[PDB]
Amino acid sequence: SLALSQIEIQQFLSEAHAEFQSEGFLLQGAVRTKSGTKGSIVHFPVFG
Amino acid sequence: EGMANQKAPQDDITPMNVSNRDAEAVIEDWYASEYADRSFQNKLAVNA
């Protein structure tokens, strides 16, 4: 019977869409990155 | 403290009253505390 449409279900997906945004870290590899540093100020020595 | 007294013979005894008192020690709670923000973990050479 067509009355089965009265108990139709709806599905809610678990993979969420994120509103269009930047993922970040775009400029990694474009600059000189140094990992695992310490302190409040990091000094880069320079030679002539 | 008690005390010895005198009385006439055959007279009723008259006690020298021994005082009583209760010394009440009231219990109190004390806390010594400090915070160590995680932003200082990499900026300190010591273990805060």
UniProtKB/TrEMBL annotation, chain A:
This is Phage major capsid protein. It comes from the Bacteria. The lineage of its organism: Bacteria, Pseudomonadati, Pseudomonadota, Gammaproteobacteria, Legionellales.
